[PDB]
Design a protein around this nucleic acid. Structure first.
Ligand SMILES: [Mg+2]
Lengths: 75, 75
DNA sequence: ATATCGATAT
DNA sequence: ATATCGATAT
DNA sequence: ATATCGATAT
DNA sequence: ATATCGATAT
């Protein structure tokens, strides 16, 4: 086998949603990576635990994917 | 210890020099990652075999770094 | 360490 | 797999 | 890309 | 066994 992909954190899932939002608001634009990161991170800082929760549940699931795949990985 | 950093390819070393060039030509601009990557890769394609050679020697050395460090890595 | 945002190369 | 280009969070 | 590994065909 | 191809993992 191959080395399993690293764990995707709750923030990593959240960044994907930021990019979705951004695409709808600016369907044309190239992403300014530096500004985009700063904006997502400022938005995440102000989110409540409720809004966060769905991203935490994605992360819990990927933590499970990762633990499962690592069982069989032989380096 | 920690996992050694992955091998830096001849191109990865080149992209650092592209950014240097770019900063001198456009000190004020934020990097458009998508466009930067496309321009770096066009430049790499047309760069002379002599110029490329120096990046290939950095990569050879980093390969040696990596092989040495991996001897003592325990996952 | 490794991942996201894009594109790319080794 | 892993790295670059920037900033960031887990 | 590339180094390495396995299956196949000889 | 060995030469080759081409998948696999990096
Ligand atoms: Mg990485």
């Amino acid at each position: 086998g191959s080395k399993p992909r690293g764990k995707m954190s709750s923030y990593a899932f959240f960044v994907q949603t930021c990019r979705e939002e951004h695409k709808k608001k600016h369907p044309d634009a190239s992403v300014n990576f530096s500004e985009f990161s700063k904006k997502c991170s400022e938005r995440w800082k102000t989110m409540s635990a409720k809004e966060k929760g769905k991203f935490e549940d994605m992360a819990k699931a990927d933590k499970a994917r990762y633990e499962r795949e690592m069982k069989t990985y032989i380096p």
